[PDB]
């Protein structure tokens, strides 16, 4: 009963996976901003030719 | 079993995990729109050249 | 006792967020596909210079 | 007691969600690698264009964190 109730819950695992999905959100934000930085360079490449 | 009940507490964590998954989904839709815009720009390369 | 363990768990929300994780997986796969297509476009740009 | 424990137990569920977020992380690392290979060619093309002119150095990476 007690050890089964230990097996039911891990709040620390939920916290690790929450931080693990937050860092993936950070990676999405960095890729979006970096891809707009690529867009400015390719826009000037269209303007050059 | 009060302290074990407080260590059982998951009600805030699942809700804020849902918020994290929601904002991740919105970030991926915005980056997908950026991907479509970027494809629309880079198809002009062989139109110009 | 029973109502506290009922409060500390939300299994239906776990199932909904797992389905939402699957939706996130599908969006990640289609973004990998459109990255592959724009990879091919940028490669055929850089070949002809 | 056992029935309340067996509805409260979600070891398999949390392991499936953790593994699926690991699949998400691996796919994101793959996308980052392909995006870096895109950045190489676009930056080298603009760099080859920039020689002999007064073209500015445009930014390539957004900002340091904090």
């Amino acid at each position: 009963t007690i050890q089964t109730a230990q097996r039911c819950d891990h709040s620390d695992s939920i916290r690790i996976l929450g931080e693990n999905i937050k860092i993936l959100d950070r990676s999405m934000k960095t890729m979006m901003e970096t891809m707009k930085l690529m867009m400015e360079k390719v826009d000037l490449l269209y303007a050059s030719t | 079993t009060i302290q074990t009940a407080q260590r059982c507490d998951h009600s805030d964590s699942i809700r804020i995990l849902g918020e994290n998954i929601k904002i991740l989904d919105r970030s991926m839709k915005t980056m997908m729109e950026t991907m479509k815009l970027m494809m629309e720009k880079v198809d002009l390369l062989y139109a110009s050249t | 006792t029973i109502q506290t363990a009922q409060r500390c768990d939300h299994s239906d929300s776990i199932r909904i967020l797992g389905e939402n994780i699957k939706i996130l997986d599908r969006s990640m796969k289609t973004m990998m596909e459109t990255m592959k297509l724009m990879m091919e476009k940028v490669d055929l740009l850089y070949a002809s210079t | 007691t056992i029935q309340t424990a067996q509805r409260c137990d979600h070891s398999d569920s949390i392991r499936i969600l953790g593994e699926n977020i690991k699949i998400l992380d691996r796919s994101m690392k793959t996308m980052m690698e392909t995006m870096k290979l895109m950045m190489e060619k676009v930056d080298l093309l603009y760099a080859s264009t920039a020689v002999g002119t007064s073209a500015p150095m445009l930014p390539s990476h957004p900002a340091p964190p904090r």
Binding site: - | - | T49 | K36, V51, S60
Partner: protein, 1648 residues
């Protein structure tokens, strides 16, 4: 006005743009004065060497004979002080020949005339200095321009041209004197005529400027090509055919070919000089256009270049993962892309590197390496301050050019701003605080957009190079320099230790081992050398190659685009070239692109930028090129020059392999865009170059001519003065002597140059006095004089030394030999004690004194620069660092450390080195004495240094001409110089100083020859033995006989070293606790951690030296004051001086102890720091604070030594045959004492060793290797175990071993040692009894603290006493016991008759020649009441071999050792000569019954003095306990021998099953033990047994007749019952041996 012509040496390139501007339309006021004074025939500025070559002076104009006599006196004093009086005539005759020969004297007088013109014109306020006559040449100086005229031709030039001419004359004077001194001290004779012929031949070239310097540039590769063409044996060479020397200068070709014909080593010495001739004038237009073309030219397309960059990324990933798995034992954080190979996945999970990934590097295109570390964006102050000049901003490009040139060239003004818009140096950027926030500066390099005001680089030509079109370095903006520092530091610290090719070059031990293996292998025929030279290395790199590896490095360090911004940075960077009087145009304040002087954007950063990455890329493509063709290779990289070592394959020869390797390297070099020209690459099996040292056939070529002819910049961070010139000369001679140039050559050259440097600057009153010149050369900086090369012991020795005893010894030799009184020494030294003690000078230099240094050039150093920076600092990083006075804290810490009650200055400086204030004073020292800090310190009061130089000159002339005397030094220049030095330190400092005074080795030891030495010289002497008669051949041929936060770590190592030797003081613990708090470690406790000099190394391989000084200094555990490396170096220098003076070494020689007061017993003494320290710590000087995560000793040291020796034997059996001849061990076993081994209990060591060997449980091949290399006399640790077990007291004290010794039968001492170490594998019988003495706590003692426990092991234990055993004594009449003397295997009767003779003649002393067999001498030494004095004649080898055989110590007690080493001839009653008076002789008797109650039958009849004396009537006396000469391991009782019969049967049967071991010799040991069996078996003994041996059914069946067909025949012969112990051991109750007998042993008992 301002100071003019501020250089005294060439430090700038030679340019002629100002001369062209002066001759064509100049309106400057001094250019008109320059133009008005030229003649009609004006030569161009590039033809300056055509005019300076015709300068001639009248002969013998300077009276320099007093210098010749003074130099002879100086060298005579030094050579008499070293007590090597047979080189004396050789050295002053070389100096006398050099200064009397007309051409060298003319060059020297030309040098003095040039340097007096330089001294007269430099640092003057006068713009125009008038007619200055140099022979037939008249010189006029008009500011920066110089006009020179001989008769009617003139040359208008710059001042750098005149300095180049003066440096040419200076270099030739150095070259000629070095050539004379080298020719006097070397086997090939004088080569001065070839030097003069070379000078005249180069001086006779009448060609244009470009062809002339083409010949001078190609003079060295052509000579190396000739040496390669005549002396390659395995590869072909066409390097000589490229060059045009045979068609341009035929006389030079004939001279180089005749120098090839006489001596190739002489050709490589002579041809390596490149600056003794003149220097080119750079064609700036064509060279500038060629550089600006080569920085933007494409040889390969970008598309192929990026693909090859991906290919190089693959091998970079492969090598980096291999390094990380080898070091950290695990895979790094990696990401496997889709499509990855399964072997990568399995090796990732198993954590292993498979040996098949090296050839398959294309699989690593799917392995992305994740974050491993973080970028350090805060450089330290060492690399920030020095070595480069900078530009603040791009609005400062207008301050590098002249305005008048911009007006004449372009027609408008420059619009220069008034101010210079910021600093021009790194240290001014620190003081103005532009480097306060480094990450804010490097954030634009992170975002990928550096600011517009930072993209400029000025290309500056390099000086003193033979390229007529120039080579250019880069001067850059501050931000790009900080980027360079951070990127190079990151690659040097975090990546290159994981790359193996660079890591073997970074490690000194691995590089040294590789160079030694290359040296031994090229002469045999393998390991040929390929040299690659990239002429366009720095200009050839392209962004498309660098971008993928830069992307991987940016992903590894969590820094975005930081490594990738430098590749695309040259596309946006403005490049201009520093050429005054040729400026670029300005349009809107910016340079305008023209292709000659400006370039807006290139494709490479330049020279020296990105140095670390480019080496990695080059190594990557070379590894690809050599791995595609299956070679074994090693790459030695030096940037643009690459040296590749390729080993021979069995299938192919060297030529085809070399052609394939050259094709592969050319192919993969071309794909990366670095095309190798075939004319610049070569292969060889006789020549290679590494570390600016050239090796010919594996021997380093001498570099005496190149190093001594180099001209240094001098006057560093100071005004010009005599002291800095003497300091740089002395440092040059010291650096030459350390870099494999002979000490005598550098010393004599330094004496000559010292006197010429004095003659330039001193008036004739000083310089016509010989005695004052000799004394002034022999005072030195140790007692306050000028820096002289004569007083350095570091020329002849490599370790740390004490100058003061050598200095006082030189002055004593000066007074006793040369006619100079002590009053003149008092006049010159002028000893002036300080009123108060300055302890900071003691903690900086422990060997110094408290005297005044009056000739030292005075910059205030300690307080003025600190006050200036703390006043003029306008921002942070200086106010924080210097918020409190560092000097007052330093003096307070010095007074706290001066309260040590035994004042030990070495430990005082060692504790001072662990303080933050020491680091602060180091940063102030780099603010004073470094590169680019001369600019600020000289620019502040730029005018005043010109007056300061003249003030110092007048002060030093008035000081040297003053005739008053100082402190009387007469008590300190008599008697022993050790006590004189200690009394001088006690007088001057006021307290006694312990631990800094090292005795002078020539006073402490005196050399002799053994041909006239007496007995008293051999009491305390060090003996050298040559194996052959030594001549000048053996000096070059090798012989047989062998040869930050780390301050916290250093603090804890020193804390352990204090605590283990039992010094305990509360105040010292408080002070080290304050050090630990100021360095951020707040934890309370943490307990964690031959060879000689290189000039005598080859001759040392022909000499055997040992320590036989034990009669007065090495018989006790007390240590004394002898530094043994210096003594062995001194003895080898004596041998070198005998050979190089025309003598030979055919007799052994000695170093006898002469001064008894130079041998002081060192007081191992606790030091108690009395007062409480007032230091209190700082905590503001360390910017990076480290984090807190970042039993009796005898038994612990016994277990640790046991496991260390066991693992040392393990790495010996894993070592190859070339490795076991080296003395390298696992944990540095060689440099350990012998006395503490005698203090240490060894029973615990033997059980620890045995339990480690049975805990290893090795496989069969390694056990076979153990038994094979221990049954033979191989392995350095076996020699170590012999040297440990030399004394038999350690043998008898081992309580397992006296029980074990009845079991084992040993033929020799090393046999007993081998059985002791490898018995548990073959016999567990005694292991079952002594396995119970195990303790697991002592096994856990770490190897890291073993040196600490050894430093604890020396004091606790005691040494045993040794015991004298007894053998047969005979004499008078008695009972016959058994007459046992050498019954094992030796002529026992030879011992019998000599014992009977020496006992009836009643001799008290016996003399034994070394022709006698050793065991007879062992019996004669163990006879009591007899003194054995051998005849050695200086060779201790016979006594050492005699001592190794014995097991008691009676040879070490009954032999008179000084009289044995002092004996040569017949002096008494002897055994050993053929016929003479008092000679005992052996005559063979064919038939005698020998009617004697003792012994049964005689073979040899002893005759003496041509007579026979009846020895047949004597008998015995009773015996006592015997030695191992009687061999009690096989005694009368058989149950110990039956246990040996049980064991040897079990020994062979186990060793048959051992793989890789064919049992012939161990079977021979079994055969000897079964011969001892066959003595008593009683069955007929076959002499030859066919003796079939084989295993049947996992049971080894071995007998005479073959039991089965699979048994193998082993032929054994020579079995006979020769010992008399056969009759002795025959016992009652036969069949008792059959009781408890194996059936196989019964089968070997009953023969067939």
């Amino acid at each position: 006005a301002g100071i003019n012509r501020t250089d005294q040496s060439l430090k700038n390139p030679l340019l002629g743009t100002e001369v062209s501007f002066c001759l064509k339309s100049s309106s400057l006021p001094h250019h008109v004065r320059a133009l008005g004074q030229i003649k009609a025939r004006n030569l161009a500025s590039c033809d300056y060497y055509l005019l300076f070559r015709q300068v001639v002076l009248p002969p013998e104009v300077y009276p320099i004979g007093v210098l010749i006599r003074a130099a002879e006196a100086i060298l005579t004093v030094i050579v008499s002080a070293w007590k090597l009086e047979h080189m004396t005539k050789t050295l002053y005759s070389s100096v006398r020949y050099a200064l009397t020969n007309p051409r060298v004297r003319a060059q020297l007088e030309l040098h003095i005339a040039y340097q007096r013109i330089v001294g007269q014109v430099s640092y003057s306020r006068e713009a125009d200095i008038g007619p200055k006559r140099l022979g037939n040449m008249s010189l006029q100086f008009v500011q920066s321009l110089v006009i020179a005229t001989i008769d009617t031709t003139s040359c208008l030039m710059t001042y750098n041209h005149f300095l180049a001419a003066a440096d040419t004359a200076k270099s030739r004077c150095h070259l000629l004197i070095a050539s004379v001194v080298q020719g006097a001290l070397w086997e090939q004779g004088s080569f001065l005529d070839h030097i003069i012929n070379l000078i005249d031949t180069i001086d006779s070239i009448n060609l244009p400027h470009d062809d002339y310097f083409t010949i001078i540039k190609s003079i060295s590769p052509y000579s190396q090509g000739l040496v390669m063409g005549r002396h390659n044996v395995s590869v072909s060479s066409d390097f000589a055919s490229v060059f045009t020397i045979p068609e341009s200068c035929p006389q030079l070709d004939s001279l180089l070919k005749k120098l090839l014909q006489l001596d190739p080593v002489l050709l490589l010495m002579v041809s390596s000089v490149q600056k003794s001739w003149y220097f080119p004038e750079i064609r700036m237009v064509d060279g500038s256009r060629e550089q600006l073309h080569k920085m933007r030219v494409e040889l390969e397309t970008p598309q192929a270049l990026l693909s090859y960059g991906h290919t190089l990324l693959s091998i970079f990933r492969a090598e980096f993962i291999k390094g990380y798995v080898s070091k950290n034992a695990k895979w790094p954080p990696v990401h496997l892309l889709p499509g990855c190979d399964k072997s990568i996945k399995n090796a990732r999970e198993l954590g292993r590197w498979s040996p098949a990934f090296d050839r398959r590097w294309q699989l690593f295109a799917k392995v992305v390496i994740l974050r491993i570390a973080d970028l350090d964006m805060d450089p330290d102050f060492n690399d920030i301050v020095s070595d480069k000049a900078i530009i603040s901003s791009r609005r400062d490009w207008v301050f590098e050019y002249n305005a008048a040139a911009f007006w004449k060239k372009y027609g408008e003004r420059l619009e220069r701003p008034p101010a210079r818009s910021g600093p021009s140096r790194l240290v001014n950027a620190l003081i103005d605080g532009r480097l306060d926030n480094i990450p804010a500066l490097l954030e634009p390099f992170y975002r990928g957009a550096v600011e517009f005001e930072d993209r400029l680089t000025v290309l500056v030509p390099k000086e003193k190079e033979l390229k007529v079109k120039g080579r250019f370095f880069s001067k850059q903006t501050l931000a790009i320099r900080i980027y360079q520092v951070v990127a190079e530091a990151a690659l040097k610290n975090e990546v290159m230790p994981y790359l193996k090719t660079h890591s073997m070059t970074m490690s000194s031990t691995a590089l040294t081992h590789l160079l030694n293996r290359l040296s031994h292998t090229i002469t045999k025929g393998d390991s040929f050398v390929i040299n690659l030279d990239y002429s366009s290395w720095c200009n050839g790199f392209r962004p498309e190659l660098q971008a993928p590896i830069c992307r991987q490095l940016d992903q590894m360090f969590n820094c975005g685009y930081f490594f990738r911004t430098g590749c695309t940075l040259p596309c946006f960077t403005t490049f201009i070239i520093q050429d005054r009087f040729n400026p670029p145009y300005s349009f809107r304040g910016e340079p305008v692109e023209d292709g000659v002087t400006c370039a807006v954007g290139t494709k490479t950063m330049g020279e020296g930028m990105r140095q670390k990455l480019w080496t990695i890329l080059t190594s990557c493509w070379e590894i690809i090129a050599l791995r595609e063709i299956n070679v074994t290779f090693n790459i030695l990289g030096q940037g643009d020059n690459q040296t590749i070592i390729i080993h021979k394959s069995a299938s192919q020869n060297n030529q085809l392999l070399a052609e394939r390797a050259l094709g592969a390297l050319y192919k993969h070099a071309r794909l990366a865009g670095h095309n190798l020209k075939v004319e610049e690459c070569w292969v060889s099996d006789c020549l290679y170059e590494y570390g600016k040292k050239l090796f010919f056939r594996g021997v380093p070529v001498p570099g005496c001519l190149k190093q001594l002819s180099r001209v240094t910049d001098s006057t560093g961070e100071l005004f010009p003065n005599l002291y800095s010139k003497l300091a740089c000369l002395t440092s040059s001679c010291l650096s030459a002597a350390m870099a494999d140039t002979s000490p005598w050559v550098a010393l004599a050259t330094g004496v000559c140059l010292y006197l010429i440097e004095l003659y330039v600057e001193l008036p004739p009153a000083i310089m016509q006095d010989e005695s004052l010149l000799t004394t002034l050369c022999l005072v030195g900086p140790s007692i306050g004089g000028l820096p002289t090369p004569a007083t350095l012991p570091s020329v002849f020795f490599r370790g740390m030394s004490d100058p003061l005893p050598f200095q006082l010894a030189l002055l004593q030799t000066l007074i006793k030999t040369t006619g100079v009184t002590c009053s003149l020494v008092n006049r010159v030294v002028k000893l002036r004690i300080a009123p108060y003690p300055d302890w900071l000078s003691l903690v900086t230099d422990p060997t110094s004194l408290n005297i005044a240094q009056v000739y030292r050039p005075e910059r205030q150093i300690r307080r003025w620069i600190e006050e200036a920076i703390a006043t003029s600092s306008h921002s942070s990083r200086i106010a924080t660092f210097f918020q409190q006075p560092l000097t007052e804290m330093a003096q307070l810490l010095a007074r706290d450390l001066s309260t040590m009650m035994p004042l030990r200055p070495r430990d005082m400086s060692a504790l001072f080195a662990l303080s933050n204030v020491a680091y602060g004073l180091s940063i102030i020292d780099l603010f004073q004495k470094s590169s680019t800090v001369v600019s600020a310190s000289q620019a502040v009061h730029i005018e005043d240094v010109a007056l300061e130089s003249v003030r110092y000159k007048e002060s030093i002339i008035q000081g040297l001409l003053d005739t008053t005397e100082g402190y009387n030094m007469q008590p300190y220049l008599e008697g022993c110089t050790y006590l004189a030095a200690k009394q001088l330190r006690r007088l001057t400092w006021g307290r006694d100083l312990v631990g800094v005074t090292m005795p002078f080795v020539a006073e402490q030891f005196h050399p002799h020859s053994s041909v006239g030495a007496k007995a008293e010289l051999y009491l305390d002497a060090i003996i050298y033995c040559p194996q052959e008669t030594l001549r000048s051949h053996h000096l070059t041929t090798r012989g047989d006989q062998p040869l930050a936060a780390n301050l916290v770590k250093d603090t804890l190592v020193l804390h352990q070293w204090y605590k283990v030797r039992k010094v305990t003081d509360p105040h010292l613990n408080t002070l080290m606790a304050r050090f630990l708090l100021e360095k951020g470690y707040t934890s309370d406790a943490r307990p964690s951690i031959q060879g000689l000099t290189g000039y005598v190394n080859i001759l040392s391989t022909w000499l055997r030296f040992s320590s036989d000084y034990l009669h007065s200094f090495s018989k006790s555990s007390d240590d004394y004051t002898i530094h043994f490396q210096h003594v062995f170096t001194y003895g080898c220098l004596y041998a070198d001086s005998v050979i190089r003076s025309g003598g030979v070494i055919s007799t052994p020689y000695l170093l006898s102890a002469s001064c008894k007061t130079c041998f002081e017993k060192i007081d191992s003494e606790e030091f108690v720091l009395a007062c409480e320290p007032q230091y209190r710590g700082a905590e503001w000087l360390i910017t990076k604070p480290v984090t807190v995560p970042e039993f009796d000793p005898c038994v612990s040291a016994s277990y640790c030594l046991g496991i260390l020796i066991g693992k040392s034997f393990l790495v010996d059996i894993r070592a190859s045959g070339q490795d076991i001849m080296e003395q390298r061990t696992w944990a540095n076993l060689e440099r350990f004492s012998i006395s503490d081994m005698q203090k240490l209990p060894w029973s615990i060591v033997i059980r620890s060793l045995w339990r480690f060997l049975i805990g290893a449980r090795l496989l069969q091949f390694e056990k076979a290797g153990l038994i094979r290399m221990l049954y033979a006399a191989t392995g350095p640790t076996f020699s170590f175990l012999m040297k440990v077990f030399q004394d038999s007291a350690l043998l008898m004290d081992c309580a397992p071993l006296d029980r074990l010794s009845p079991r084992i039968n040993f033929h020799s001492r090393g046999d007993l040692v081998a059985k002791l170490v490898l018995l548990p594998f073959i016999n567990p019988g005694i292991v079952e009894i002594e396995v119970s003495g195990i303790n697991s706590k002592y096994h856990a003692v770490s190897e890291a603290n073993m040196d600490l426990y050894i430093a604890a092991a020396k004091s606790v234990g005691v040494k045993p006493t040794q015991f004298v055993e007894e053998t047969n004594d005979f004499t008078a009449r008695g009972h016959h016991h058994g007459c046992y003397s050498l019954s094992w295997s030796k002529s026992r009767n030879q011992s019998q008759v000599l014992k009977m003779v020496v006992r009836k003649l009643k001799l008290c002393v016996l003399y034994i020649y070394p022709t006698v067999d050793p065991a007879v001498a062992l019996d004669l030494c163990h006879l009591p009441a007899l003194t054995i004095i051998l005849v050695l004649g200086g060779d201790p080898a016979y006594y050492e071999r005699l001592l190794e055989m014995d097991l008691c110590g009676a040879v070490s007690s009954r032999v008179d050792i000084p009289h044995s080493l002092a004996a040569r001839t017949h002096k008494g009653f002897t055994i050993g000569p053929d016929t003479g008076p008092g000679v005992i002789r052996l005559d063979k008797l064919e038939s005698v019954c020998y009617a004697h109650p003792c012994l049964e039958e005689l073979e040899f009849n002893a005759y003496l003095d041509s007579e026979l004396v009846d020895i047949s009537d004597m008998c015995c006396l009773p015996l006592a306990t015997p030695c191992k000469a009687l061999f009690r391991p096989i005694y009368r009782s058989l149950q110990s021998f039956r246990l040996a019969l049980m064991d040897n049967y079990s020994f062979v049967m186990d060793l048959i099953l051992i793989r890789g071991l064919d049992i012939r010799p161990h079977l021979e040991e079994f055969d000897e033990l079964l011969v001892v069996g066959q003595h008593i078996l009683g069955q007929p003994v076959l002499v030859e047994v066919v003796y079939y041996v084989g295993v049947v059914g996992k049971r080894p069946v071995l007998a005479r007749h073959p039991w089965s067909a699979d048994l193998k025949r082993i032929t054994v012969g020579g079995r006979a019952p020769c010992p008399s112990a056969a009759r002795l051991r025959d016992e009652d109750c036969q069949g008792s041996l059959l009781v408890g007998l194996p059936a196989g042993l019964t089968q070997l008992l009953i023969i067939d």
